[PDB]
Amino acid sequence: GDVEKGKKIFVQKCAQCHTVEKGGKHKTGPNLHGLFGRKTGQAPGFTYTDANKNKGITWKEETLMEYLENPKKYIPGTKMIFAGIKKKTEREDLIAYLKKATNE
Numbered sequence: 241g242d243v244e245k246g247k248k249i250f251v252q253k254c255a256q257c258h259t260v261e262k263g264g265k266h267k268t269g270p271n272l273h274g275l276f277g278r279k280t281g282q283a284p285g286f287t288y289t290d291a292n293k294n295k296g297i298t299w300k301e302e303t304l305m306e307y308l309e310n311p312k313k314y315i316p317g318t319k320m321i322f323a324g325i326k327k328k329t330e331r332e333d334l335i336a337y338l339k340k341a342t343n344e
């Protein structure tokens with residue numbers, strides 16, 4: 241998973257709604273710091289849909305690969321408006337970026 245390639249994918253597809261920094265700002269979407277190994281819907285100070293709050297999985301590589309491929313299929317009724325990233329490589333690249341960025 242190429243971190244630098246993941247950076248650019250994040251900017252293109254994710255940055256309009258999400259920050260990755262520790263104590264970063266909530267926007268349209270929750271700040272993503274400390275994402276890995278946390279349950280869905282647990283970012284402090286963000287109002288989630290009941291669907292995201294009660295999804296009840298743990299974020300990791302496996303779960304992110306499935307989610308980012310098709311958000312609304314994984315979490316029906318999410319308010320995250322994003323169609324998905326179809327390609328495996330692109331997703332692994334992005335997830336590599338997040339593993340690092342959301343843990344610094």
Ligand code: HEC
Pocket residue numbers: 250253254255256257258268269270275279280281282283287288289291292293299308317318319320321322
């Ligand atoms: C790159 C394609 C993106 C990644 C990676 C993520 N998003 Fe989003 N996102 C948005 C909202 C409003 C929410 C909350 C929606 C709801 O509660 O139904 C989300 C949710 C996520 C989550 C889960 C958060 C949790 O802690 O459980 C992850 C991991 C996530 N998103 C990653 C908004 C948007 C958005 C605005 C239109 C875009 C372009 C994206 N999200 C894209 C990405």
